[PDB]
């Protein structure tokens, strides 16, 4: 749980630094982009540079599998007993 | 089935109150946003305030795992026999 | 495979009729909306009527679980041997 | 791992050629579209031609199941030992 959390955070900071610099976004926006992209929500306009597109493509292939491993444990290995056992 | 339904509804009402107040959306729109976000459909513009972005980020990590647990039972534990057994 | 195909097609035609009439879309667009919504791709603007939003909300909860059951068999129960066995 | 990689790449090149020609996109954009669509991220405007919509519909049904099989192995069969075993 701790390990997947670390990998997820590191993946998110890479994305924040990438998009803040190459796409010119304010860090809160580059984090938001990173997050809604790896979670496949996507409620954003696409990157506008060719370098942003290519990176986004590679980021999704590598990052999705991690982010979603993390979310299974987050809900299904921490919220579950918490919530379930009250019941 | 009843329990996941409760947690889902509560997650959705939190989102409705959040976005109606901070993003200024009419409640039907704040519910729609909440729903299309946790289901990762996302066919909306992003939140426009920094507080909306941060909350959306935390909401997705916590909420997705629940919403999708709920949907497995909804289709796969209620529609299945209903539909299957006619066949 | 045949059964999930039927349920999916019926779900898609409901959506086509719904959005063509209430959202005023041409049938090809109401089908496209229906499809990119149940698959959570979502690369569309949101519905614009309150009745469209509510229906979209209910449609996603009921429809997603079916559409994705169908897609597991489509790739994983028809394309798999086809492709795998050449190899 | 090698086989799913081949099928994924071939699926992506079909999409690149399709959208570059029928939707008129520059190849980097037609690849980006293809990728964010099969991964259900979708942070793009929809196709604008009827032929683009229909193809997109068929592309998602056939392509998603493959792309996501590929991503399970990518993170869960190559990044896992790499990362896990350092720990
Ligand atoms: Cs989207
Ligand atoms: Cs999406």
Distance D71 CA to ligand 2 centre (A): 17
Residue B29 C-alpha from the chain's centroid: 13
Instruction: Choose the closest CB to C39 out of D40, D44, D54.
Output: D40
Range of the domain at A84: 1-87
Cβ atoms of D30 and A50 within 8 Å: the answer is: no
Give one DSSP letter per residue of chain B, joined into a string: -HHHHHHHHHHHHHHHHHHHHHS---HHHHHHHHHHHHTT---SPPP-SHHHHHHHHHHHHHHHHHHHHHHHHHIIIIIHHHHHHH-
* Cα–Cα dist D51/D37, whole Å: 16
**Interface residue of D13, D36, D76 to substitute, partner A, most A CBs within 10 Å:** D36
Question: Number of folded domains in chain A?
Answer: 1
* Cα–Cα dist C17/D65, whole Å: 27
* Closest-approach residue (CA) in chain D for A34: D41
Q: Burial of C86 by CB count in 10 Å (0-12 exposed, 13-18 middle, 19+ buried)?
A: exposed
Name the structure determination technique. Answer: X-ray
Cβ atoms of D65 and C71 within 8 Å: the answer is: yes
Q: CB atoms < 10 A from the CB of C49, how many?
A: 11
**Interface residue of D40, D50, D65 to substitute, partner C, most C CBs within 10 Å:** D65
* Cα–Cα dist A31/A16, whole Å: 5
What CATH number does the domain containing B21 carry?
A: 1.10.287.70
Q: CB atoms < 10 A from the CB of A5, how many?
A: 12
CA dihedral sign, ordered B47, B51, B54, B57:
negative
């Amino acid at each position: 749980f701790q390990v997947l959390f670390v990998l997820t955070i590191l993946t998110l900071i890479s994305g924040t630094i990438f998009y803040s610099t190459v796409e010119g976004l304010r860090p809160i926006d580059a984090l938001y982009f990173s997050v809604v992209t790896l979670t496949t929500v996507g409620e954003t306009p696409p990157p506008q540079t060719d370098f942003g597109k290519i990176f986004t493509i590679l980021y999704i292939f590598i990052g999705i599998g991690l982010v979603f491993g993390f979310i299974h444990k987050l809900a299904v290995n921490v919220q579950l007993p918490s919530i379930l056992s009250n019941l």
